[PDB]
Amino acid sequence: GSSGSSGSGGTLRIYADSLKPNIPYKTILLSTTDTADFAVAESLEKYGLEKENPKDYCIARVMLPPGAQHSDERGAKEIILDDDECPLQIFREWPSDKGILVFQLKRRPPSGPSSG
Known about the structure:
The chain has helices at residues 36-47, 87-92; strands at 11-14, 26-29, 57-63, 77-79, 101-107. A 3-stranded antiparallel β-sheet has the order 4-3-5. Strands 1-2 form a two-stranded antiparallel ribbon. Helix content is 16%, strand content 22%. By secondary structure, it is of the alpha+beta class. It starts with 10 loop residues before the first strand and ends in a 9-residue tail after the last strand. The chain has one domain (1-116): Ubiquitin-like (UB roll), CATH 3.10.20.90. This is Afadin. Residues 8-110 form the Ras-associating domain. It is found in: Cell junction, Adherens junction.
């Protein structure tokens, strides 16, 4: 047992445009404390991945460049997160000037580029 669900907490739009193309975007109730792993799993289950390994997938945040003003995600570069980060808190205190922030769900680099 566990008591929770109070107030609002926060929301996070997990587009994850890759792991699940069929589905457009996903939104799960996130908090200003939860970790990535948690979200990952959640996001997974949401899409219907209640089996896959959430430890394999992480929450890669995509930040828009400073010199962008024409299209969307204009040559945006995402940077995987540690693991015990906050995809909600981060955004909550994310500078718009730095560019839009997006949290996609996709595999992370284990050790070096290109897993293969």
